[PDB]
Design an enzyme around this catalytic site. Structure first.
Site, PDB file in Angstrom:
ATOM      1  N   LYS A  12       0.897  -1.147   0.000  1.00  0.00           N
ATOM      2  CA  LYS A  12       0.000   0.000   0.000  1.00  0.00           C
ATOM      3  C   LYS A  12       0.934   1.194   0.000  1.00  0.00           C
ATOM      4  O   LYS A  12       2.088   1.066   0.430  1.00  0.00           O
ATOM      5  CB  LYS A  12      -0.814   0.052   1.295  1.00  0.00           C
ATOM      6  CG  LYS A  12      -2.140   0.729   1.112  1.00  0.00           C
ATOM      7  CD  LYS A  12      -2.979  -0.150   0.230  1.00  0.00           C
ATOM      8  CE  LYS A  12      -4.397   0.379   0.049  1.00  0.00           C
ATOM      9  NZ  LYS A  12      -5.342  -0.769   0.203  1.00  0.00           N
TER      10      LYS A  12
ATOM     11  N   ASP B 224      -5.972   4.443  -5.619  1.00  0.00           N
ATOM     12  CA  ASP B 224      -6.787   4.272  -4.431  1.00  0.00           C
ATOM     13  C   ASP B 224      -7.592   5.523  -4.160  1.00  0.00           C
ATOM     14  O   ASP B 224      -8.132   6.146  -5.079  1.00  0.00           O
ATOM     15  CB  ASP B 224      -5.954   3.913  -3.226  1.00  0.00           C
ATOM     16  CG  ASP B 224      -6.777   3.263  -2.162  1.00  0.00           C
ATOM     17  OD1 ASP B 224      -6.974   2.041  -2.245  1.00  0.00           O
ATOM     18  OD2 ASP B 224      -7.239   3.985  -1.254  1.00  0.00           O
TER      19      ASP B 224
END
Lengths: 416, 416, 416, 416
Positions: free
Chosen positions: C102, C142
């Site tokens: 991430k 994202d």
């Protein structure tokens, strides 16, 4: 194989003179890497012929491996491994930042076109490209290779490397037009001139006026002669070649003798001088004796007759183990070859530095730096031979070996 | 050496059967590259032990070299040089975009701890790293190596490669948790069945109800048994092993058998099955013969006693040259090993593809690709021999050596 | 920290439902690598501003790490650490060749010009370039980043990589003009249906004519609504949004509802329909309940009022642990978000394969593979939940973490 | 963090003495890159234990980042970010071609066996490999790390790097068997003495026969004592250690003193010498004072009793800001730590120079340069002191920070 087997022994024998794990010995007994390749070469007649070459990287614990390339019809791995091992002690004793390596091809340059020699040099590099670099392995010239061959080889490398590195430094013995260097002409003999000077000191003896006899009158022989007489003021009373020696109590002139040999083909029949044999030469009553041609010229047979104070080994292996003990007992100071004739490799290292730094030195600078290097290597060996009570050749392998042992330890290759 | 020597003279004999330069032949008589190294390992006892290994890249004209790693105390380069040549004719007949390679380490796996071995697997890679990539050379498990050792090798590669390439694809026979695949259990036997199946076809025959005797009850034999009977409807009339064999004209049940031996230690004395000998088995009177254990078990001696319609070579070099020629006139179809037992490497290719593409397949998928492959190779060989009026093995080498000659020619390695 | 701490706890817990070492446990309680950077950006006002971004690569044992990049003013490493760990369990359960990562940058994309964001996108890349590649780490979009942004990122990359590798593959979620694929639009909703399809079998129920109520009406919600009804023939009796919901037993039309909201700003007041609160919708008595808006909507406080057969978590964390039990022992089938909503991360993997293979598929192929993949993963977890008597959510973590465990073992990262 | 925070303030206060963009300030207020890894280690007991380490590359505007690694159980990232910041000003003030960086691992050397610390050094490297290089980031020894750890580090780097670069130069403080150097042993005390000469000159004073007092008697203290007295002709009238001091007007003999401490355990009680406390030492009446042991020993409290002409800071952080203004007012020359104690880092750059060029220098050569560099650095700082009229500590920071500022401006990292 015999040649290698002889090498290990050399090693196995020196240990006895020192503290060294077995983990160590075991390691130091095989080369770290061996590469063996098939090199397809296109012969002048349009036929493709496959050769076989090797590159052996013995030990790199102390630095990137240094070692020349040989072209010879009777070449073998064992030979290559053995000689690789040797360079290893060579670089070490000289305390240079390199490991030792060596290559060879089994071919007959003598039956080869200039163009077929170029394509073999290129094929070699194309073949073993993946293990060479200016920081991994740096070759150079050996039996039947010269600067020309070095340059074709540097050139094929840059073509592969694409210039992302200091390409001129992947190999030495290069022609000056491409990062090569002068001073490399007299290296071996010049280097050898420095041990002797030192050796003299050891024996509390002054060279001026002293005498020298040189076996062999090639580059080393020719230069060793010019220098000892010119710079050191020694007397060159004897010189010799493949065909005979010529003697002269009053001292010869190297340039003159050189001319004669070059016009006559031999030093023999040199006017003003007496003709003598080679064995004759070895047995003269001279201060220093410089065997600079072939090996095993000093043996149990003759060892007993050698009357030199200093025996300067410019060639590889002139002396024998047997001959070793007698000359020792006899009290003669011997400058093992691998220390005596190491100015070659030293200068080569000087060339590499200049290639990687991009900065070029004067000859003077370069000679100064060579002196220092030799000057230390000698004392380093001498002092060890004294203290441990062993000849210079045994001393020498002890100096060498420990240096590799330490580094191997510090890296943690072996734990003890 | 002998083995190599042997291998080579098998190439020279097939040469006779095709039109191929001497440029080609000489070329194909040596491996392109051999690396030999000493790998220092830290013993579970704080001692460091130097081991010896090789990787030999024979020929990569047709694509990257593919081949296994063998861990054995009696290993030799000659054997490695020899199996690497073998790998080279296997992939080509199979028509894989690969070359041939092999590797080996001289060590006794049996007295090594799991940790010691991981340290060995890792050191190997740390040593031959420069010549392996998913695009250069792709290893696999061999004698005394398996999917765990592979995992360890792949892992240290990733750590040096820094993951800048498709790392799962740098080696095969991997555990599924890491790019590994499952169609890999019955590949060798599964691949062989297809040829038997295509073999039956040419022989205007149907294996349903047909019989088969199998020499050896290891992986290959067990599964050979299992499938033949199970997907084909054949009658396994006898199995056989290390110690002895079992007969039963009514049809044994592999799984049953395997248990026995697993529980028993041998396929010997089975309930309701009469005991017999290995040699008995070979001269048994069955439609198919699957020697799948050892070398030379069909020679000049018994050649004449083999009453098989088909001899499926599952094992390495079970039959022989003159044994080869007798069965031939006798009219017996032989499925030469490197073609017969090639499913295992054909599947490992399938593994590498998936590794390189990130795209994983299904057993069914995979299988259909195997079949397809095994089939053409069979035919390709079958027609060569028919047309050229020579034996399958001979025809195989032909198709093999033929594709390798084309490739180097098109690359310009050899001019004709 | 918090969300991280929470994360870790999530882990420890499921552990207790499985056999695993503490070596392992300890290993999975921390990301292998975290990188934190300062990114100078040239603002539109001529001033340079330093931003701060991160990339966290949690665990790469099963493959290269996969995970989006968030652009948020309230971002923290923890949050990032925490989601990276989540990305790890998601790929495993989806059984992908990926590890988990991430990334995040602290900023306000909202006060940013299109040009400022581009300069930020390129800087991130110029910053963490040394640790990303199509074989190492593959980002995606994202919170507050999108296709435009990915392209800008992909471009800077190529600019550094020099196109020496499958460049389009270094990042997912791209526009179709450069490696982007199209089935990516309804992926999350689409993949969710398959699972809903499978769950309805687990329950022996034909969805046709059945009911579904969706909390939230975004792209996910809208598509879930659109598909389930059109393709599976369900009745959407209620949908809802930021402001309220609408109800209509006769069932709504996903499009009509969508247009009103576009033109009207909300689903509220939709014609012919009945207005209700979100809570009501939650407590409707429907067959399927699709929460795809926000977390913590299903709590200890209302888990008792939930009346759906299956709870399809489209959103991230709509249910709680406490609600977990109640709903478990109450008999409701919950589909964990991280499996339920893995349709996006799946099709993304489908995007990478086409980028690295250069082969691009049709929408029908892609969908084909997407169903096969979702279906398996359901059943994987379903079966595990059955077998161990645990809830989908707990089942899920068991499957995932076991899978990452085997790999770290097979690699020998931990030895037990 | 408190310590990072402290550093930041240190800088903001220097801002106040010079013209610097605010764009520059903010940049300088954060490290360019931070990497944090989890390093799995194989414990002597067969278990694998994951450790935590960092490397902080603060700012590289002026060259590759230079900086030590610390092993310590109470290590923190902020301590690390803080020291890196510090490294950054130390190199700039020295006008060395580097930025600054620091690394650290959280562990207890002091219960790790040598084999564990080797597996630890190696994993660091295997972990942060992607961001270190002899051109990128060059570590060195710090708290609980030594030449042996460096060598293990250099080795694994070479193993990953494949010797494609000057591998010996990716790290310093190496053992000489592999790139290390000498003249590195008195580097700190020796650098300190040149600045002490300079000062004297600034002051117009002649050191021969003047007095010095050294608080602390470790290597630097021991070395400062030998040097100032032996090379400069000073009278060492008092030295002191962990326990207490000793005083003697005629001068102490550092070797005599060191053996006594060595055999006895402290300098206390040295024969013929009077004992005194540390505090009395500080307030001794000497021309020069050299606190070379612990921090904050010169405070508002005693600032007024300092009676020396010059305060040579061999220790880090011996004088406070408060003591800073009093002494300044009182007219005492203070030679700041980070400037005064810089002969270490300097000599570490000299090692890197030799490693990269393959040329190794003589101690006398090495000393020739150290002198030069410190000499210059001293005067750059001094002259800024008179000019802007500030205290040496302030002045050093200006010169440091300004240098970093120009470079970031010259690269366009910030616009003004």
């Amino acid at each position: 194989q015999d040649p290698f087997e002889i090498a290990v022994k050399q090693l196995e024998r020196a240990a006895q003179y020192m503290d060294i794990s077995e983990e160590a010995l075991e390691f130091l007994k095989r080369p770290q890497r061996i590469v063996e390749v098939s090199i397809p070469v296109e012969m002048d007649d349009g036929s493709v012929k496959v050769f076989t070459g090797f590159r052996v990287q013995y030990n790199w614990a102390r630095g990137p491996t240094k070692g020349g390339i040989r072209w010879h019809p009777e070449e073998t791995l064992s030979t290559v491994k053995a000689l690789a091992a040797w360079m290893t002690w060579k670089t070490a004793v000289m305390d240079l930042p390199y490991g030792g390596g060596k290559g060879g091809v089994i071919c007959n340059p003598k039956e080869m076109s200039d163009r077929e020699k170029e394509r073999l040099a290129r094929g070699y590099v194309r073949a073993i490209y993946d293990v060479i670099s200016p920081y991994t392995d740096i070759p150079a010239p050996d039996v039947y290779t010269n600067p020309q061959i070095m340059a074709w080889m540097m050139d094929e490398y840059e073509t592969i490397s694409r210039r992302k590195d200091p390409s001129f430094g992947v190999i030495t013995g290069k022609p000056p037009s491409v990062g090569g260097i002068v001073a490399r002409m007299d290296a071996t003999a010049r280097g050898a001139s420095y041990t002797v000077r030192e050796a003299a000191k050891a024996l509390g003896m002054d060279l001026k006026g002293k005498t020298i006899a040189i076996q062999g009158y090639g580059n080393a022989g020719y230069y060793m002669a010019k220098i000892m007489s010119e710079e050191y003021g020694m007397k060159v009373v004897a010189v010799s070649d493949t065909k005979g020696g010529i003697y002269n109590p009053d001292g010869l002139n190297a340039d003159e003798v050189l001319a004669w040999k070059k016009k006559t083909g031999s030093v023999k029949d040199f006017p003003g001088a007496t003709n003598i044999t080679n064995e004759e030469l070895l047995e003269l009553e001279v201060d220093v004796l410089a065997p600079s041609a072939i090996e095993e010229v000093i043996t149990k047979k003759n060892a007993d007759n050698i009357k030199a104070k200093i025996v300067a080994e410019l060639a590889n292996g002139p002396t024998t183990p047997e001959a070793d003990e007698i000359l020792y007992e006899k009290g003669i100071l011997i400058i093992p070859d691998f220390l005596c004739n190491a100015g070659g490799v030293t200068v080569s290292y000087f060339e590499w530095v200049q290639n990687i730094t991009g900065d070029y030195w004067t000859v003077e600078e370069t000679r100064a730096k060579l002196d220092k290097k030799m000057t230390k290597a000698f004392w380093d060996v001498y002092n060890t031979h004294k203290e441990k009570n062993i000849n210079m050749r045994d001393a020498a392998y002890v100096v060498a070996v420990s240096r590799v042992y330490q580094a191997m330890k510090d890296r943690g290759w072996i734990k003890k």
